[PDB]
Design a protein around this nucleic acid. Sequence first.
RNA 1: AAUCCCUUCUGCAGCACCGUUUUAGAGCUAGAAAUAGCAAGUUAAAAUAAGGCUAGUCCGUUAUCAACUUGAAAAAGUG
DNA 2: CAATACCTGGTGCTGCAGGAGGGATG
DNA 3: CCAGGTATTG
Length: 1317
Amino acid sequence: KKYSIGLAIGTNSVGWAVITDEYKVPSKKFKVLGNTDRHSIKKNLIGALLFDSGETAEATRLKRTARRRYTRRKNRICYLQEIFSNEMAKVDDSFFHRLEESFLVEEDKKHERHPIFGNIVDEVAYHEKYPTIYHLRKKLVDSTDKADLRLIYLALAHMIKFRGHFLIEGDLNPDNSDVDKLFIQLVQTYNQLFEENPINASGVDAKAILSARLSKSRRLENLIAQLPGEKKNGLFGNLIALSLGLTPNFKSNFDQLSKDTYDDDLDNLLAQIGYADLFLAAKNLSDAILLSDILTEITKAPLSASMIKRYDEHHQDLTLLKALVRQQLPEKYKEIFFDQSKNGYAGYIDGGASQEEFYKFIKPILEKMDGTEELLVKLNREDLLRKQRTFDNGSIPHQIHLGELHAILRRQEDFYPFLKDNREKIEKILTFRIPYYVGPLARGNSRFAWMTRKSEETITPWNFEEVVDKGASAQSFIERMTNFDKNLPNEKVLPKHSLLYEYFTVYNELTKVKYVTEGMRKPAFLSGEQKKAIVDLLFKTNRKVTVKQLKEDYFKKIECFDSVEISGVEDRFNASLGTYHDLLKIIKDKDFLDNEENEDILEDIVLTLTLFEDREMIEERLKTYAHLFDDKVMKQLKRRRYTGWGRLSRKLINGIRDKQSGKTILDFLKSDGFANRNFMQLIHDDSLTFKEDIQKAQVSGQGDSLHEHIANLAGSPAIKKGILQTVKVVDELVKVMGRHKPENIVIEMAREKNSRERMKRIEEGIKELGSQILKEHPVENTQLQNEKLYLYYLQNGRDMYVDQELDINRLSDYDVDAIVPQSFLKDDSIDNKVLTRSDKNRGKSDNVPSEEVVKKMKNYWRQLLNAKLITQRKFDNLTKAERGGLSELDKAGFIKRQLVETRQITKHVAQILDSRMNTKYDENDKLIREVKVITLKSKLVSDFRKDFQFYKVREINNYHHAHDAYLNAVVGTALIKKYPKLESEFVYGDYKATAKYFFYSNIMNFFKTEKRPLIETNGETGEIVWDKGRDFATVRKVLSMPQVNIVKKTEVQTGGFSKESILPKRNSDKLIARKKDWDPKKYGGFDSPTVAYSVLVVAKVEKGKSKKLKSVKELLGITIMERSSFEKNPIDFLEAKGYKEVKKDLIIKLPKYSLFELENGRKRMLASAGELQKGNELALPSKYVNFLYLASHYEKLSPEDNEQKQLFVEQHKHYLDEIIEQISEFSKRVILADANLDKVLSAYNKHRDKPIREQAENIIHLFTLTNLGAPAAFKYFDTTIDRKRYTSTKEVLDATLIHQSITGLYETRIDLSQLGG
RNA sequence: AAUCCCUUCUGCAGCACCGUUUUAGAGCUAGAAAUAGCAAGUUAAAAUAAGGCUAGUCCGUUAUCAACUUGAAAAAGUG
DNA sequence: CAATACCTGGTGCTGCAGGAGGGATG
DNA sequence: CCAGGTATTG
Ligand SMILES: [K+]
Ligand SMILES: [K+]
Ligand SMILES: [K+]
Ligand SMILES: [K+]
Ligand SMILES: [K+]
Ligand SMILES: [K+]
Ligand SMILES: [K+]
Ligand SMILES: [K+]
Ligand SMILES: [K+]
Ligand SMILES: [K+]
Ligand SMILES: [Mg+2]
Ligand SMILES: [Mg+2]
């Protein structure tokens, strides 16, 4: 009674099957619990678990940081109001009270309804004088008169509440925003600065070029093109890119700018290369540009002046437009200016029409009339009838608002002393930001917090530097997320640029080098002293060590050789002692670097230089070693910084020692007799204690629950959910088998609204490219789902193999080609595809695109890569011909990869299963592997199905998952029975090119007959593995079984309370209050809450004026918001809902997808408290499935054999009317959608003359009507069938509730009809 | 299971711009009223998961969940 | 009550830490 | 986008 388990793991399903020795699926009588007449039921041991996808914690994060930002903006306003409190009380004792209650209706207000002044005359006068807040801001900046304290507060609060971005570190001169004069002065500085050949700025419109709204690099390209004799990589072009916003490097010219550390960066660069006024004229021009796009001798507040310009132009253009429409088109006036439902001005101001929609609506009306030329120019400039609060204000830096705030404070502190004293406090309120390396300012109740306090007191924007330890917190920010050595899980990894780590890497690479001379018969390793000599003579004198250097400067000059051959390294050594030479240049003391005593200190310094990024903290930590280096060396040292972390810790590299030998890993790597064992051999050697000590280190950390362990894997949270469910399914199956472990467990893992991503990728690439391909051809995200159009836009409308424009309309004429041919690699993704007019122009179809195409198109390809329209992998594959093209080894590897699962995630799943199955040790204290775990790629079973006609159709039902599992079980098991030597490739354990190509290509031919023998056996054992006369019949019978255990995981719904839309007030009890006292009838609110789970209530409710008690049984949906209160005390909750005399013990909790069975096997699932999903699977017989498969698609190019498939399709055409029949009988029994079924029958009767292929495809479409789960709309040819929904859950209150275990084999059935009174 | 770069998949932190909602921004004239004819419109306040106690410039949408017995829970046991 | 149609919150940026896989050694 | 909530129309 030996058995094996087959598993198919996916992101929404775990298919499972149990097989015996003969590849049969058993069947058992399983006990049934509950109050039903049924006491047991027969189940086949095969099925599939279905579940909704597990989501990422990202949306939670975004919304959580937003919650924090709203809290902190409120606290900003609260600080500002606290500063104003007393003097405002002297002026107006209820001003802030009216501000906070501005949202209430006049009936609910406690003070006068006019907020600012408290009476109508002064309010109307204010709005007449200051129609927008920016009028008041400009007035308060420019005027010299004492102003009302309330208007001052309103201006300062409007600046602080919407304060602009923080993308620039430094100050901003308010004026000097003339692009032209700053570019001219830059040109003068360069010309009189440089030695000869002065640059030309004659007839240049640096203003237009730089100020045009464009990508930084495209404006760079334009300005460079204007300059004769200047490269885009020219030094002056580099300075221009510095001024534009890019980071240039003057390293190559002489062998973001806004970062704060970037100025220290520039200072050390100046130390390295010894006039900079062009830089002081470069960032000045950067300001000029950035400011000029947004906005100076007439005011100190130019931003509010620009907003007032917006307002004035809006007024003038609106007057002109009203007059023009009244004169020329008097009949549309209402529609344009009164109808909020239309996208005219009325919908633009009061409706829901955006600026873009309003423009789309009014462009034809402007083109239709006369005198609309300037208005149309403003429209195409996106500068017509503009509001002031718009989407594009994200460009406004906080320095602008800060300048206006400071101006107002300077004006009004002459009249208000508390403004003079609190000026810097208010400025700080505006400018203060919590640093990213500090995190939440918590006190021990935030699982995300790491900040440590210098003193225990409340943190404010002003005492932040004294209360918050900006030092220790910035250290914790990195150290909490630092990686731990996998071998010693309680040790921190070394910095990637640590001297010890680089020594380790160099010695590990060097210890496997071999060399041959004439005197030697066979190659030899390098001795420890040879390796030390090579390190001291070469690695410590050159950054990179070439094989030529190894042959000449060592084997010739030391060992006195003339011809020696080297193996283990080719051309140049990959490892290098980079930090050694960095420090040798900085400190200039080789004996200090070579003194082993000085290792520690150095490891400290580098650690600092890696751990932090701030200059002050780095200097503070390096102070401990100030006495060791001259001041110049200390300044050069603090300017140097590293990033990145290694994979191994210091204790593993050079700490733990082998008990017998007494030396560390690095000691072995430096000298290991004549074995020269490397790191892997060291930690896997049974004669050394490294293996055992690593084992003893691992265990203590991994004593935690299965869920935590699976959380610690790397992968999508959806596939992690799948993995956890897979493990639980295996546990349940083992329990079903009488706690006997299986012989094999075969696992296969499937491969892994993105249209907006395509749109964003293309928009960014085209605007960075500076192309007008979207002005010429506007496109929507739905059109980008077509492969050819997406390729067209990614290629800027050009052929990729030949210099020639592409025509959009002729996309059907063109070809989509694989960069690496698909006979070699089955890559069908954008990363390996190209749109070209004719694939013939690629060159030869058997390799990488020819060298000629590369020579033609490399520059255009590089332009596409810089705009991120192609990836780096795509570019490399396109230009592989430059580096020899595809070698035969690549040919063999592309095929071995198609059939050997080499993912770390499938390896992790197999390791979990293996460590859960095999737990006993033998007499030699080695593991007893009772259970072998196999990992297969989906292509094996896919090719099996296609070769032996066991086709899958995903749309018919969810059975295929289960079937896949079964097939996986079968094939895998058979495979390792036929070729045990392949265990190393497929079974979890710590155990010519043409040859392996042929072998892996034909690995699955033992199943085929063509003459191979009828019976296939193992060569050595003589055991039978496959009977071609009997076992295929077994597989067919298994795939034809109608009873398959499909179980949809019942899940409590979590997440948001409801839809987020804040609806207008409405006389409906469906509205939910947004605050405790905000009656939705007066204020609006939310609707559409999500039911966490429903509850079966059995009680009485009052009926009629008499309040008589009437017995009821109904489903009450507990919403996500109600859940905590209902669970704290269900009886009080239900009584508050209106129920009386609740039968507490009859309360049944019903999560989403709870299963009910009614009459004639009709099943329903709970979609919520008031809707049901389809609960039955349509078990279509196998012959119909294979017919639908074959007839669904043409058979073209064993193409002569495909004639037999076509003849079978045509000989069994009557199958169509049978399939429809099978559907009809199903629907009438189970679905109960009379109108939809009649429409579908009429549609099938309508197209009986259509070709068989298209009828088959639309019949595939039909199964949406019968699929398990929520109803969905579908299409039969050109007829649309809307979903028939189940808008009532009354019937399930008398049906049979079915509780299912994870496999569905164990059940518990409750006949709810026995509940009532 | 080397380094570099790229891509993709994950986790955390700090910000910005809108959108919505109610109220404020005296609508006028003729109508009994409905309605008609005109004037106007760009701005602001406040909320932005109800809220919680642990009162922090903190926390509140991920992960986990058939039934039944035990347990605070994680989880074990039951065919 | 059952069929029918409509609805559904978005965008942009800065830093950091990691797993992976692909292609090459800048 | 999918699919559960909502009002409107019978
Ligand atoms: K009142
Ligand atoms: K040029
Ligand atoms: K609008
Ligand atoms: K090399
Ligand atoms: K760093
Ligand atoms: K959910
Ligand atoms: K959940
Ligand atoms: K279940
Ligand atoms: K990465
Ligand atoms: K790698
Ligand atoms: Mg709040
Ligand atoms: Mg607003």
